[PDB]
Amino acid sequence: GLPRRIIKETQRLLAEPVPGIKAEPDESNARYFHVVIAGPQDSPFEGGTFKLELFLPEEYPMAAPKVRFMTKIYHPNVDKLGRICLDILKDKWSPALQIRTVLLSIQALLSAPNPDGNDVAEQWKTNEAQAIETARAWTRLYAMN
Amino acid sequence: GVKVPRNFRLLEELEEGQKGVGDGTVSWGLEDDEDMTLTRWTGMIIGPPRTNYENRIYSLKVECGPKYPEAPPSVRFVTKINMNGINNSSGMVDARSIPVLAKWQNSYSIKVVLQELRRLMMSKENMKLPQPPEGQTYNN
């Protein structure tokens, strides 16, 4: 009941970890991954550490993995419950993409916010300088311990 | 078998809460919309017809802990109710008296818990109980 591909991806993640991203499978569930993404340099999230969790549904890799932040973060594409607006997690998902690809994309997403509804996203548009400084404040407050 | 972890299960139930099920006689949603832990839920039951609960709306607090759904949730009524298994002064639901809670399966959910309580409102021992006036709530 466990696809060979998943066993391979898991083993590749543990042996070839992505820089700045820690990602390990759960002790009780091989489809469940605990993720820690370091805030990218030159972004307002720098210095912070962000907890995510990833899950591979039965129909992976036909369906996308499900990913969610567990660290409170002020970002245009992340809502109050940590849910991530990212195209490859829905309409633009293709089986040629890996778990590794997802985490890199999320990591990229932190360096390049995508304002283009949402209250935070509106703030990033109408007042980007203010929004950035709020993201930095939230990094200090909720992403350092 | 493929297990869905707590948090991703709770997101599924969050979504099912918004879409709603059946005739809408029970409903549920997150208590605090910023609660990333998805722990505290607001539950609602419409009193079944042809009982002393009929035409009454009951609000409930449901707490899904760190082991949910492998372990059952905590349930308490906020709206006052006379009903077997519900503590008269606190409104806490005594798990031992609610079969869904005492014989919990991980296939169950907040929905199942609410539908179970509403079913039990139709039982012989509950349906004829004289009820408090509406508009009363427990403390805390």
Swiss-Prot record, chain A:
Broad enzyme group: transferase
PROSITE patterns membership: UBC_1 (PS00183), UBC_2 (PS50127)
Post-translational modification: Conjugation to ISG15 impairs formation of the thioester bond with ubiquitin but not interaction with UBE2V2.
GO aspect biological process, one term: protein polyubiquitination
Catalytic residue positions: 85
Domain of life: Eukaryota
Catalytic activity entry: S-ubiquitinyl-[E1 ubiquitin-activating enzyme]-L-cysteine + [E2 ubiquitin-conjugating enzyme]-L-cysteine = [E1 ubiquitin-activating enzyme]-L-cysteine + S-ubiquitinyl-[E2 ubiquitin-conjugating enzyme]-L-cysteine
Regulation: Activity is inhibited by binding to OTUB1, which prevents 'Lys-63'-linked polyubiquitination. Activity is inhibited by GPS2, leading to prevent 'Lys-63'-linked polyubiquitination.
A molecular-function term among this protein's GO annotations: ubiquitin binding
Pfam families in UniProt: UQ_con
InterPro entries attached to this UniProt entry: UBQ-conjugat_E2_core (IPR000608), UBQ-conjugating_AS (IPR023313), UBQ-conjugating_enzyme/RWD (IPR016135)
Localization: Nucleus; Cytoplasm
Pathway(s) of this molecule: Protein modification; protein ubiquitination
EC number per UniProt: 2.3.2.23
Gene Ontology CC entries for this record: cytoplasm; cytosol; extracellular exosome; nucleoplasm; nucleus; protein-containing complex; UBC13-MMS2 complex; ubiquitin conjugating enzyme complex
Per UniProt, location of the Glycyl lysine isopeptide (Lys-Gly) (interchain with G-Cter in ISG15) cross-link in this chain: 90
Outcome (variant: residue 92 to R): No effect on ISGylation
UBC core domain ranges (all copies): 1-144
Signal peptide boundaries: none
Keywords: Acetylation, ATP-binding, Cytoplasm, Disulfide bond, DNA damage, DNA repair, Isopeptide bond, Nucleotide-binding, Nucleus, Transferase, Ubl conjugation, Ubl conjugation pathway
PTM-bearing positions, type N6-acetyllysine: 80
Known role: The UBE2V1-UBE2N and UBE2V2-UBE2N heterodimers catalyze the synthesis of non-canonical 'Lys-63'-linked polyubiquitin chains. This type of polyubiquitination does not lead to protein degradation by the proteasome. Mediates transcriptional activation of target genes. Plays a role in the control of progress through the cell cycle and differentiation. Plays a role in the error-free DNA repair pathway and contributes to the survival of cells after DNA damage.
Subunit structure: Heterodimer with UBE2V2. Interacts (UBE2V2-UBE2N heterodimer) with the E3 ligase STUB1 (via the U-box domain); the complex has a specific 'Lys-63'-linked polyubiquitination activity. Interacts with RNF8 and RNF168. Interacts with RNF11. Interacts with the E3 ligases, HLTF and SHPRH; the interactions promote the 'Lys-63'-linked polyubiquitination of PCNA upon genotoxic stress and lead to DNA repair. Interacts with ARIH2 (via RING-type 2). Interacts with OTUB1; leading to inhibit E2-conjugating activity. Interacts with GPS2; leading to inhibit E2-conjugating activity.
Family: Belongs to the ubiquitin-conjugating enzyme family.
Protein name (database record): Ubiquitin-conjugating enzyme E2 N
Swiss-Prot record, chain B:
Pfam families for the chain: UQ_con
GO CC terms, sorted: cytoplasm; extracellular exosome; nucleoplasm; nucleus; UBC13-MMS2 complex; ubiquitin conjugating enzyme complex
A biological process term (GO) from this entry: protein polyubiquitination
Induction field: Up-regulated in cultured fresh blood cells upon treatment with vitamin D3.
Tissues and organs where the protein is expressed, per its UniProt entry: Detected in placenta, colon, liver and skin. Detected at very low levels in most tissues.
Domain of life: Eukaryota
Boundaries of every UBC core domain copy: 5-140
Coiled-coil ranges per UniProt: none
Sorted UniProt keywords: Acetylation, Ubl conjugation pathway
Protein function: Has no ubiquitin ligase activity on its own. The UBE2V2/UBE2N heterodimer catalyzes the synthesis of non-canonical poly-ubiquitin chains that are linked through 'Lys-63'. This type of poly-ubiquitination does not lead to protein degradation by the proteasome. Mediates transcriptional activation of target genes. Plays a role in the control of progress through the cell cycle and differentiation. Plays a role in the error-free DNA repair pathway and contributes to the survival of cells after DNA damage.
Assembly description: Heterodimer with UBE2N. Binds CHFR.
Family: Belongs to the ubiquitin-conjugating enzyme family.
Protein name: Ubiquitin-conjugating enzyme E2 variant 2
